Structure formats: structure tokens, C-alpha cells
Design a protein around this ligand. Structure first.
Ligand code: HEM
Ligand code: HEM
Ligand code: HEM
Ligand code: HEM
Lengths: 141, 146, 141, 146
């Protein structure tokens, strides 16, 4: 469960991301694909080379979904409903992969937001991504 | 893998009583029922909408037999799982695109099926040995991923 | 989320366990310690030899908590609040360990309840144990 | 630890810019703040009740230095991590009773700290090499558990 403090921390850090969100999403994916190669099995139809348009395109979609979750932080299960259905019924993403992406997103944010990535913010962000992962995984069975 | 001689013989002895046909069909079927999303890998198998349909699906049964046959051949190569499963690793990664985490799930389902079938005979020490085997097979099948 | 069929499935299965719950809890622990030695780090104060009295006692307590959860399946967070508090503030059990014990409980049930351990019941029980685990780690942070 | 020479040079080059004492304190501190149940291994360290109490705690800072000093020393022995960490592995199992999953968590927190400190310079390829290293150290530290 996110606390009032967690919510504040996440809105603030994500606020600073702003219109870099799509770029950071794409970096998070590249970081994931390189550090954890098994995650590439879900994207056999993508060109995964550095700077790929499919990567950039997907990174934006992931980033927009996170932005929408932050915008609806008090109603995430409903705000992410459509996405939760999609992942459960059309994709077969093993839950551990969400942990891998979440980690890579933290690394990316740390790499770009030195002043905002404090210990308490790092903690709130990890809780936030864990909550998002839970929602997206909630209709699996 | 690091298997003790009493462990090696415990595995081998039990396996000699295994009906690979039945166990293979049961293991793969249970995987598909317990973790429904793995059905995405088997779209061409047909009706998988209910557990009964899954368990009765001839394609599920035939493929379970094939999987466990490979597994079975691996038990005769415990000292070299990596070399035994190399081509199978490449295939799972390059043609099939299967997340290796699924190999771990099938492995544990397999352990549950063995327990279901052998009851009392599937003691805690026998289980421990099989957990090492199942993790070694998983790791071997994941080895050539890139 | 547990469906009505899962709830029925779990109540039936657990009902047959009956008076052996304590014995099965202890067996599951023994299986866990042998299969996954790292779990032993949480019990440095126990004699973990086969048949030791601490494992028997702990097995009963685990089993009784599960019995409680089955009875309060529609209200688990409340029924297990105290245990949730205990694990979050007094113990340091890494979440992965709940999956290990959950697997060992299923193995123990399969070994003892062959007629009842159908594929549908296996699915329900796995979901139920995952729900209990979720509740027990819900107050970690 | 299968590390390409180009990976090994990437790791070493960066590590040469690290202030181990400072990074050690930050990494251990963030572990205790982000995963608060790990505070149960350090009840003798005093006040860990808020983020500033943890990050500024002199015992946390001193312990972080000790931890990362042993880590660096591992970086000089990448071809024999198991040997380098044997006695520490035994100690963490038999005396401290630390679940090895915590070594993986610390490794990931260290990676975040590196990213935080180096920014752009911590490129995706560099990170990938550090991920192999931290997994290799965790595996080495877990290897004597029994
Ligand atoms: C932070 C958690 C994640 C979020 C918010 C997220 C969000 C999204 C979004 C918005 C889409 C696009 C659906 C559409 O086009 O309408 C999508 C699709 C997809 N996601 Fe997830 N995702 C997450 C994690 C993951 C992970 C961990 C994996 C597996 C490694 C994954 C694999 C996929 C795949 C394969 C698609 C379909 C891509 C395509 O065919 O174009 N996602 N996701
Ligand atoms: C013990 C672990 C496993 C072993 C030993 C194994 C082995 C095999 C073998 C021998 C084949 C036949 C390959 C061929 O036709 O040349 C095969 C095919 C296949 N396997 Fe695996 N497998 C394992 C686990 C899994 C898992 C967990 C999944 C996915 C959930 C999976 C998905 C597939 C698929 C989709 C095929 C192709 C089936 C078809 O032709 O339609 N396997 N496997
Ligand atoms: C199915 C999930 C679990 C349930 C329902 C459960 C339940 C319980 C119960 C009822 C107690 C006794 C509390 C008391 O006496 O007041 C307890 C304590 C404890 N649990 Fe959990 N437990 C679970 C999983 C685990 C996991 C996986 C571990 C770590 C491997 C663990 C570690 C402990 C420890 C170390 C104690 C204290 C034992 C003692 O000092 O006597 N538990 N748990
Ligand atoms: C990179 C991984 C780690 C390394 C290389 C490492 C290394 C060390 C070293 C060199 C010592 C001092 C040994 C002694 O007192 O003789 C130590 C002590 C200790 N470590 Fe680890 N450590 C690591 C991770 C962890 C983790 C993640 C935890 C728990 C979350 C932990 C818990 C402890 C504790 C409780 C002590 C004793 C502290 C005291 O003096 O009271 N360590 N470690």
C-alpha cells in the first residue's frame, strides 16, 4: 500500500521526468534487454538494435501508461484495467519480468535525476512500480 | 549436477518405476491449467478452455510424452546436462521464444505429479534429490539463451 | 482473486486434511529445509533434525493459521492481521521463501490426498497459498 | 563469471572512479531504507527509524565500507569468486544466518547507486557487465550455505 508520503514522492519524481518519459521508457527497455536477455523472448517481432523505432515506440507506450497511473494514483486498478486484461489474456509475461523492468526503470531514473533520487524517493518509486506490476498481473488466473 | 551417490541412486531407482506417458501428459496438462497464460505457447493444440479439455487433449498428451522423453534421456547424462540439452536450449530460445522461467515452473509441477503418483515413496530426501535435478535441467535448457 | 469455485475447492481439500493438518505442516517444513537449505537461516534457534519437537510444534501453528484462513477465506487480511504484523515487524523473511513453502505444502498435499488433488484443485490451492503469502507480506513496507 | 574482456575492462575502468567508503555507506543505507525488514540484521546499530537516521548512522556507514571493501577485493579476483568469498560465505551462513537473497538485493541497490553517481557514464552495456558481476558475487557468497 502506498502512503501519502509515497504518493507525494512519486508525483514529484515523475513530475520532473515530464516530457522525457518516453525517452526514459525506451532506455529502460534497452537496459533490460541487455542485462537480462531472456526478456527478449517476448519481442521476437521487434528490431532490438540500439535506437530501433520499435523500441522507441514501445518505450513511449510504457511511459504513457506509467504517467496515467501516477495521474490516477488513488484508483490504479481501474485506470490500468485495460492493460491488466491485455497482459493476462494476450501475453504470457512471467511475473518475474516485471521485477526486472522495474529495476531497470529505477536505474534509468537514478541515471537522469541525481537530485530527486533520494533514498526515500527510491523507496517510494520501488513500492509504486511493484504496485503497478501487481495490478498488471492481477487477472492472470 | 552436485548429486550425491545416494541421491543419484535415489533418483534413478524412482525413475525406473515411472510411466513416462502418463506422467508427461499429466505434468504438461497441469502446467497449462495451473498457470493458464502458458497456453499462449500452445494455440495450435485446440480446445484448452477447461481443465478437463486440457487434460483430455491428445496433443497435450502427446507433447507431454515428448517433453518427458527428453527429460528422461537427461537423467542418463547427469554429469553433463549442459551438453545434452544444448541443441534443445538453442531451439527453445531461437525458434520457440520460451522464457526459461517456464522450465522452472514445469519442473515444480513435475515434482508435484511424482508426489501425487508415489505418495509415501516420495519422501523428503527423494524430493530434495529431484529438486536438484529439476533445477539443473532448467538451468541447462536456459544456457544457450542470448 | 479467488473465485467461488476456488473457495469451494480449497474448503473441500482442506476438509479432508482434517486431523492430519499438523502432521502435514511439519512434513512440509521438513521437505522445505531439505530441498531449499537457505530457508534454514530463519530457524537458527530450532533443532532441525528429523522428528525434532520444535518442527512438530511449528508445523501445527502454520497448519492452524491455514485452517483459520480457509474459514475466513472471504476476509483474510483481517483474519491474518496479527500474523501479517508479526512477519513484517519481527521477522525478516524474504518474500521468495513464501513461494518455497507454498510449493512444499502442495507436494505434501499431493502425497497424502491423491483422489482430491485433481488439476482443478491444484490450481485453486496454489492460488490460495499465493493469496495467503500476499497477505503475510502486505505490511513489509 | 563469464565476462568478455571488453566487459572486464568496462567494470575495472569505472571501479577506478569509485569512492568505496562513500558508495559502501550509500548502498547499505539504501538497502535498509528501501527494504526495511533487513534492519532485523542490525538491531545493535541503534537508530534506523527514518531515512536520515539510517543514511547518517555512523555504524551503517562503517559497515558499508567493510562490505564494499570486500566487494572490491572480489573485483580483483573475477576468475575465482567462489574461492575469494568462501570464508565469508561460511560466516554469513553459520554465524550471521543471512538469507542469500539479501546479497542479490544489495547488488541491485549497488547498481542503482552506481547509476545515481555516474549518470550518463553508466551506460546500458556497462550496467549489463555490472549485473553479471553482482550476480556472480551473490552466487559466490551463497555457495557454502548448507
Ligand atoms: C511497468 C510495467 C509494464 C507496463 C506499464 C507495460 C505497458 C504496456 C503497454 C502500454 C503496452 C501496449 C499495449 C497497446 O499497444 O495498447 C504493452 C504491451 C506489451 N508488453 Fe507490457 N508493460 C509492462 C511490463 C512488461 C514486461 C515486463 C514485459 C515482458 C518483458 C512486457 C511485454 C509486453 C509485450 C510483448 C507487449 C506487446 C508489444 C507489441 O506487440 O507491440 N511488458 N505493455
Ligand atoms: C523439462 C523441460 C522441457 C523439455 C525437456 C522440453 C523439450 C521439448 C522437446 C524435446 C520438444 C520437441 C522439439 C522438436 O519438435 O524438435 C519441445 C517442443 C516444444 N516445447 Fe519444450 N520442453 C520443456 C519445457 C517446455 C516449456 C515449459 C514450454 C512452454 C511452456 C515448452 C514449449 C515448447 C513448445 C511450444 C514446443 C513446440 C511444440 C509444437 O511443435 O507445437 N517446453 N520441447
Ligand atoms: C504459508 C505461509 C506461512 C504462514 C501461514 C506462517 C504462519 C506462522 C505462524 C502461525 C507463526 C507462529 C506465530 C506465533 O507463535 O505467534 C509463524 C512464525 C514464524 N514464521 Fe511464518 N508462516 C508462513 C511462512 C513462513 C516462511 C516461508 C518462513 C521463512 C522460511 C517463516 C518463518 C517464520 C519464523 C522464523 C517464525 C518464528 C518461529 C519461532 O520463533 O518459533 N514463515 N509463522
Ligand atoms: C556484497 C555482499 C556482502 C559482502 C561482500 C559482505 C561482507 C561482510 C564482511 C566483510 C563482514 C565483516 C565480517 C566479520 O565481522 O568478521 C560482514 C558482516 C556482516 N554482514 Fe555481510 N556482506 C555482504 C552483504 C550482506 C547482507 C546483504 C547483509 C544483510 C542484509 C549482511 C549482513 C551482515 C551482518 C549482520 C554482519 C555482522 C555485522 C556486525 O558486526 O554486527 N551482509 N559482511
Amino acid at each position: 500500500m502506498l502512503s501519502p508520503a509515497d504518493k507525494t514522492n512519486v508525483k514529484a519524481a515523475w513530475g520532473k521526468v515530464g516530457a522525457h518519459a518516453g525517452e526514459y521508457g525506451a532506455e529502460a527497455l534497452e537496459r533490460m534487454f541487455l542485462s537480462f536477455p531472456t526478456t527478449k523472448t517476448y519481442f521476437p517481432h521487434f528490431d532490438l538494435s540500439h535506437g530501433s523505432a520499435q523500441v522507441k515506440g514501445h518505450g513511449k507506450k510504457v511511459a504513457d501508461a506509467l504517467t496515467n497511473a501516477v495521474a490516477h494514483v488513488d484508483d490504479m486498478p481501474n485506470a490500468l484495467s485495460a492493460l491488466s486484461d491485455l497482459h493476462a489474456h494476450k501475453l504470457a509475461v512471467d511475473p518475474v519480468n516485471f521485477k526486472l523492468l522495474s529495476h531497470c526503470l529505477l536505474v534509468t531514473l537514478a541515471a537522469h535525476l541525481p537530485a530527486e533520487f533520494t533514498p526515500a524517493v527510491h523507496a517510494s518509486l520501488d513500492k509504486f512500480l511493484a504496485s503497478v506490476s501487481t495490478v498488471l498481473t492481477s487477472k492472470y488466473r | 549436477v552436485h548429486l550425491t551417490p545416494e541421491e543419484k541412486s535415489a533418483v534413478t531407482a524412482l525413475w525406473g518405476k515411472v510411466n513416462v506417458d502418463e506422467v508427461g501428459g499429466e505434468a504438461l496438462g497441469r502446467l497449462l491449467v495451473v498457470y493458464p497464460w502458458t497456453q499462449r505457447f500452445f494455440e495450435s493444440f485446440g480446445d484448452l478452455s477447461t481443465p478437463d479439455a486440457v487434460m483430455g487433449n491428445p496433443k497435450v498428451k502427446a507433447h507431454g510424452k515428448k517433453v518427458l522423453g527428453a527429460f528422461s534421456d537427461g537423467l542418463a547424462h547427469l554429469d553433463n546436462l549442459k551438453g545434452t540439452f544444448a541443441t534443445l536450449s538453442e531451439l527453445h530460445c531461437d525458434k520457440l521464444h520460451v522464457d526459461p522461467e517456464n522450465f522452472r515452473l514445469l519442473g515444480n509441477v513435475l515434482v508435484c505429479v511424482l508426489a501425487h503418483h508415489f505418495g509415501k515413496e516420495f519422501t523428503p530426501p527423494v524430493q530434495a534429490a529431484y529438486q536438484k535435478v529439476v533445477a539443473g535441467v532448467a538451468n541447462a535448457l536456459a544456457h544457450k539463451y542470448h
